From a paper:
The LASV glycoprotein complex (GPC) mediates viral entry and is the sole target for neutralizing antibodies. In its mature, native form, GPC is a trimer of heterotrimers comprised of the receptor-engaging subunit GP1; the transmembrane-spanning subunit GP2, which contains the GPC’s fusion peptide at its N terminus; and the stable signal peptide (SSP), which remains non-covalently complexed near the membrane-proximal region of GP2 post-cleavage. The GPC is expressed as a single polypeptide precursor before being proteolytically processed by signal peptidase (SPase)21 followed by site-1 protease (S1P). We present the development and characterization of prefusion-stabilized, trimeric GPCs of LASV lineages II, V, and VII, revealing structural conservation despite sequence diversity.
We focus on LASV lineages of public health concern including lineage II, one of the most common lineages that circulates widely in southern Nigeria; lineage V, which circulates in Mali and has decreased pathogenicity compared with lineage IV; and lineage VII, a newly described lineage isolated from a nosocomial infection in Togo with comparable pathogenicity to lineage IV. The resulting soluble constructs feature sequences of circulating lineages II (LII; strain NIG08-A41), V (LV; strain Soromba-R), and VII (LVII; strain Togo/2016/7082). Combined, these approaches enabled us to determine the structures of GPC in a reproducible manner and yielded structures of LIV, LII, LV, and LVII GPC trimers at resolutions of 3.8, 3.7, 3.7, and 3.1 Å, respectively. LII, LV, and LVII each have an additional PNGS at residue N271 or N272, though this site is uniformly unoccupied. Similarly, when comparing the GPCs of diverse lineages, we observe high structural homology. Using the prototypical LIV GPC as reference, we note RMSDs for pruned and all sequence-aligned pair as follows: 0.78 and 1.9 (LII), 0.85 and 2.0 (LV), and 0.73 and 2.4 Å (LVII). The main differences among the GPC lineages are found in flexible loops, most notably the loop (residues 166–181) extending from the β7 sheet prior to the α3 helix. This observed heterogeneity is derived from areas in the EM map of poorer local resolution, insinuating greater flexibility of the residues in these regions. Consequently, these differences may not represent physiologically important conformational epitopes for LII, LV, and LVII GPCs. We observed neutralization of viruses pseudotyped with GPCs from LII, LIII, and LIV by both 12.1F and 19.7E, consistent with the binding data.
Numbering used by the authors:
A (entry chain B), C (entry chain A), F (entry chain C): 60 to 254
B (entry chain b), D (entry chain a), E (entry chain c): 259 to 419
């Protein structure tokens, strides 16, 4: 006890009970990360060496008109996309919204020696910093910069892939939490270099 | 007495029962109750991570009951609510601490002091983490002791001084 | 009295005295709503079954260059337009700024059975939710959803029309108030589905 | 003594006269005056709808006098002022309550307690509405009584304890 | 005791040494120290220009030490920090006062009262300017005297009342 | 002293010590204004009667891809540009980013009698109001409107020129201060007329 009579006690919150109102971020490992979106469904976010979309096309505006997707899942994805620092297209994103499915891929793999040398930009900086905000408590794939000393990071991965999935227990490395989404949602001021 | 952080009028918080956290708010304990004297501090606070979680839980409670079968959350209801419900500055402070390798709140564990003779407790404060682990009691012992003193002052200044 | 000696008393503010600094929202009935903009002038906002603009054109950028309009009235209208959730053009708005007049019309009437089934989008969701924020204390034309249980609404009306008008007493259903405008003005974070 | 919520330095609020609401602020009464002790709470408050209306009125007063013949309001002056003057979070909380069918402030009537022997009054709080009407005293009686107790404490703790 | 406005945990502020401003924070004095009782007010304050400068200095201290050789500031680190560190509403209030010809804080000089027998000092408040010059003591004498009274009350209410 | 025992004392902060984290605004005279950006470098902002860029072109997006500039200097310039009230291009800005240099020029000189009569717009209003926010404590070139009674200003100057410079003592009329930049950075809500 502290000062004779105070016992230190611990409270820990179960944020899974918030799943009907807020999306909840989770982590499974160094690559897989998750967002619970509904009671049964959510998004899977992965970091890989393998491209699954070989398209250089997205045609997002046609996908939107097609309107065969869950608006909640789409809303979260577009939240992510438009929260990217130094937002622009830079090509970068290819997608597939045929039917009602969702598959979105970012070309982090863009990085080559000249842009690697610049570090603080060229698509990967903005995508990775958004990923890290969605993923609070996730795996800090900043590697040698894992505790965040520096704010420009690079990863070994080539692609960030976001897909519509089934909610199953994952959350092996972190507690479900609304903070990631809320962070991205509230941080809407100015964060660009080019416009 | 009453709270300012709830959305619901009176029903959100009654005076005589204090304020309780149920089994769906907590992970291991079935029930934890705090006196309104401490919980009411969130009526005024511009800080304390605990108070944002407390507001998000109140929101979830009302949102579910009001929108019968919320089915798939609409997202737009919560986005408006977020601007109304949480301290964005506070999330950003913890974000800054996460970056730059400074112990920060990851919104999981909270700690509080509980008197061993009486039932008085403090408002919970976030247990911080660093390098993937929780900080020891010896690193944040200054705050634990300060909290104990604050509770002592409140116990002593009862009715009149 | 309360506790023997406290009398409960009522204070009510006259917000019309704020008309030289802030625009003031008002309501007349289920359709007509108003904004006082100046000492003598303001905007009329109506919900109707009759189109007054048969144009599929707005040419807002040419109207802006023409520059024969009151900047204050235009500023309020563009505040409204750019505050629309899921903002895009979607055609949606037609206008007429010939001379110095203002007439702006939104195609809420777009709604047909497929989009009606979707509810949470397709122009009307975004326009109606902006209208309701401008109109605090106005007529809650959400109809069966009048107290706002649910956040996706539909109305019987086909068009939202905004016009330059003369300030005359209206304000039959509500108190003049700066809150509507202030609400829209301060709520500038993120509220989209498509971008 | 002085206020922090005014823009004007000293002229915005004098200590000895208390703070008064004139006939152009109020609808039915020609004059209502509050002690600075209660009004000064808006110096600190992050809540209370009354305090935003109070700031908007101070702004209007200065804006008119400074910009001789403001003619047609420029809009851009107020837009900047809004970010400086009001609690946006609070408007959004009332917006959330309006939606979801929860009693909310529509910024019209406010209520306060007034002592029947002395001249002491509380800071006004927003009278809430629901389903187009004002709530009865019996629905918000918990807050009316809490306010009475708060006033009693202040009257009792005079000069020293 | 401890502070809530620092980013650093405990190291940011120790209790027994009070809180000091070094020669690189101040322009003319080599050293000025304030008691934690007054500095700690920034733990709660939603106002006082001094508290934002105080937070920016803490940020600068940590940012430099954490990012060894920050070289050229990245800008993006500070932009996120700004949302976490400062009172934006307060800058906008001073902006409004600058416009409309009202004395306003230009974040340079601050003033405080210092007791001539004991070492007690107040938290600094911004010295305002108007028409390119600092205001005289006679224009803001109401606040100087109010601050003196506030300090007197604190000195008198020592240990118990 | 006040109340017998309180001595009034003055504290003044040296904000130059913040130069490694935040850009610092300064003023030299009625025309020259400065921003310290790094330990050795910064931006010079001037008001002149002489154009140095005779181009009607900027080609900012090509400059960005060329990527021979300091990202910090560019970030500050784009902060300024995108903070302009009633933001649009309106032509207005011409630039030169050949090599690694920075030279940006705004056509304040656009103003002629019709637009001068309108006052509250037509490029100069937005550029000048951004300049004044960057320049807190700077020279209030609002002239007859120097204390800011009114919020629409005009200056005698024809061009606003921003260039990459060497930090040398300047700061003759003001204290280095992060407030200007912070003001522009945090003020991100809504401030347009046209969009
Ligand atoms: C704030 O930071 C804290 C840091 O502690 C996060 O809290 C949790 O921390 C623990 C580590 O102390 C995380 O890991 C857990 O380990 C338990 C034991 O692990 C052994 O057994 C497993 C078998 O699968 C081996 O792989 C491992 O190497 C060890 O030998 C596991 O039992 C935990 O749960 C697992 O099993 C259950 C089923 O019984 C599954 O449902 C789980 O998904 C999981 O597979 C767990 O792996 C722990 O993950 C951290 N999170 C949680 C939720 O407990 C806080 O989460 C963080 N805050 C936020 C918001 O993220
Ligand atoms: C917060 O919510 C409250 C809810 O009460 C709004 O306050 C006002 O509430 C009253 C209802 O109690 C509104 O209606 C008023 O009714 C009065 C009596 O109505 C009879 O007579 C009329 C004759 O025209 C009949 O149509 C009606 O059916 C009844 O038989 C009217 O006298 C009121 O004013 C009318 O006449 C005057 C001229 O004398 C005109 O200047 C008015 O514009 C109007 O035509 C009124 O109609 C009332 O409208 C609500 N608002 C106001 C301003 O009083 C609060 O307004 C709301 N807060 C905000 C910010 O909106
Ligand atoms: C908030 O508002 C205050 C207003 O007072 C600003 O504070 C400073 O105010 C003084 C005026 O009181 C400014 O001017 C200074 O004048 C001193 C004396 O001037 C004589 O000598 C010069 C010789 O160059 C003549 O040109 C002049 O006409 C007078 O005859 C100068 O000594 C000051 O410094 C100069 O010399 C030093 C080298 O010794 C250089 O390093 C300086 O850059 C400069 O050339 C100065 O000119 C003064 O500029 C104001 N600022 C500062 C930093 O002191 C606050 O700055 C303002 N707050 C903010 C955030 O801006
Ligand atoms: C997602 O959030 C919802 C809402 O918080 C969680 O649903 C809730 O589940 C609990 C049980 O775990 C329900 O509590 C009650 O349990 C008793 C028996 O113990 C039962 O008799 C009651 O009828 C009730 O079921 C609670 O009512 C229920 N809330 C609602 C409105 O559904 C859900 O479990 C969360 N999802 C996950 C994966 O945690
Ligand atoms: C729009 O706002 C303005 C400013 O609040 C209101 O103008 C004000 O009107 C009042 C009278 O109603 C003026 O008060 C004074 O009245 C006495 C006589 O009673 C007179 O002698 C004074 O000269 C003065 O007129 C007040 O000064 C005036 N303010 C200004 C600067 O114009 C206006 O009434 C509001 N509009 C509406 C529709 O309410
Ligand atoms: C820009 O900001 C940096 C950081 O605040 C300033 O650098 C600092 O300069 C001071 C000296 O003025 C250093 O203090 C120390 O001085 C003693 C001797 O007096 C010396 O023994 C120490 O080694 C140290 O140099 C301080 O450490 C240093 N901070 C760092 C990390 O560089 C810089 O002066 C500011 N620029 C301008 C133009 O003011
Ligand atoms: C870490 O994540 C990877 C995926 O990136 C896991 O490997 C595959 O996961 C999928 C989806 O669950 C399975 O269908 C595959 O069968 C897995 N691959 C193999 C070879 O089994 C990997 O197992 C995860 N690992 C941990 C926690 O060690
Ligand atoms: C985006 O649109 C292009 C349009 O060219 C699609 O590419 C295919 O183009 C050929 C003609 O060269 C058509 O016959 C195919 O039917 C088009 N495919 C599709 C799916 O429409 C491209 O595939 C589209 N990409 C996405 C993600 O929709
Ligand atoms: C495939 O995965 C590896 C990791 O297993 C990625 O890592 C890079 O590997 C190369 C070759 O050894 C090194 O030069 C890089 O420095 C590594 N990257 C980092 C951040 O350390 C590799 O990038 C992935 N993709 C490809 C196309 O090789
Ligand atoms: C409710 O609003 C409608 C308009 O949408 C009113 O009907 C017309 O209003 C205009 C404008 O004031 C008049 O010029 C027309 O003459 C009105 N129509 C008719 C047939 O008289 C309607 O009167 C309003 N009603 C209320 C409060 O009952
Ligand atoms: C927007 O521009 C179109 C341009 O075609 C306008 O339509 C008319 O086009 C015919 C030629 O086909 C011209 O002779 C008319 O003079 C044009 N009308 C006008 C008003 O310019 C359309 O009307 C314009 N719409 C708006 C709202 O300005
Ligand atoms: C014309 O006004 C009526 C209301 O008087 C609108 O209301 C719809 O009417 C149809 C036919 O009875 C119903 O099927 C719809 O369900 C009603 N809408 C709602 C929201 O209940 C009608 O939309 C208006 N316009 C047209 C072109 O008919
Ligand atoms: C005020 O600023 C102007 C520049 O706009 C100064 O004049 C020139 O400044 C440049 C840059 O330092 C020098 O290279 C030129 O030689 C200066 N011109 C002349 C004729 O000497 C001007 O000196 C500044 N003045 C003050 C404080 O009086
Ligand atoms: C923006 O691009 C135009 C492209 O026309 C540049 O103008 C020159 O155009 C001639 C052909 O008419 C070429 O031979 C020159 O090489 C072009 N100059 C340059 C620098 O590319 C214009 O100068 C460019 N402006 C900027 C600021 O880059
Ligand atoms: C050149 O500098 C002068 C100032 O020295 C600018 O000032 C204008 O001068 C004209 C002619 O006397 C006046 O009619 C304007 O009213 C002055 N402007 C203001 C705001 O007072 C002049 O604009 C500059 N440029 C040019 C091309 O003349
Ligand atoms: C994504 O949604 C589509 C809807 O047509 C479904 O067929 C597909 O299986 C879903 N994807 C996953 C991984 O469950
Ligand atoms: C604190 O240190 C003790 C002794 O090494 C250890 O047993 C305990 O688990 C530690 N607790 C935390 C939270 O680090
Ligand atoms: C709108 O402004 C024009 C200015 O040319 C005027 O002629 C017209 O009558 C005004 N409209 C209304 C409804 O008063
Ligand atoms: C409260 O109830 C009484 C009794 O029915 C009624 O006379 C009074 O008008 C009501 N007041 C309000 C504000 O509802
Ligand atoms: C205040 O007035 C006195 C007397 O005129 C003068 O000496 C002093 O410098 C003035 N101080 C300020 C800050 O204006
Ligand atoms: C701007 O940067 C370029 C880099 O190529 C340099 O050559 C030029 O001299 C710099 N401009 C100034 C005014 O120092």
């Amino acid at each position: 006890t502290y000062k004779g009579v105070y016992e230190l006690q611990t409270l820990e919150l179960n944020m899974a009970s918030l799943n009907m109102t807020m999306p909840l971020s989770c982590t499974k490992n160094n690559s897989h990360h998750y967002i619970m979106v509904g009671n049964e469904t959510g998004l899977e976010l992965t970091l890989t060496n393998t491209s699954i979309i070989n398209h250089k096309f997205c045609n997002l505006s046609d996908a939107h008109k097609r309107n065969l997707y869950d608006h909640a899942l789409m809303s979260i994805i577009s939240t992510f996309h438009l929260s990217i620092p130094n937002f622009n297209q830079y090509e970068a994103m290819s997608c597939d919204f045929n039917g009602g499915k969702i598959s979105v891929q970012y070309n982090l793999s863009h990085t080559y020696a000249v842009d690697a040398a610049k570090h603080c930009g060229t698509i990967a900086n903005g995508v990775l910093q958004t990923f890290m905000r969605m993923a609070w408590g996730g795996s800090y794939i900043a590697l040698d910069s894992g505790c965040g000393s520096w704010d420009c990071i690079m990863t070994s991965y080539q692609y960030l892939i976001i897909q519509n999935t089934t909610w199953e227990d994952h959350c092996q490395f972190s507690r479900p939490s609304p903070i990631g989404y809320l962070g991205l949602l509230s941080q809407r001021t100015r964060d660009i270099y080019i416009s | 007495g009453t709270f300012t952080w709830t959305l619901s009028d009176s029903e959100g918080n009654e005076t005589p029962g204090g304020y309780c956290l149920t089994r769906w708010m907590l992970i291991e304990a079935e029930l934890k109750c705090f006196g309104n004297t401490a919980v009411a501090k969130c009526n005024e606070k511009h800080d304390e991570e605990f108070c944002d979680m407390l507001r998000l839980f109140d929101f979830n409670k009302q949102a579910i009951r009001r929108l019968k079968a919320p089915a798939q959350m609409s997202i737009q209801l919560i986005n408006k609510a977020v601007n109304a419900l949480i301290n964005d500055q506070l999330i950003m402070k913890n974000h800054l601490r996460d970056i730059m390798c400074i112990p920060y709140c990851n919104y999981s564990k909270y700690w509080y002091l509980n008197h061993t003779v009486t039932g008085k407790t403090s408002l919970p404060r976030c247990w911080l983490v660093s390098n993937g682990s929780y900080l020891n009691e010896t690193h944040f012992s200054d705050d634990i002791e300060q909290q104990a003193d604050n509770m002592i002052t409140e116990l002593l200044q009862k009715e009149y001084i």
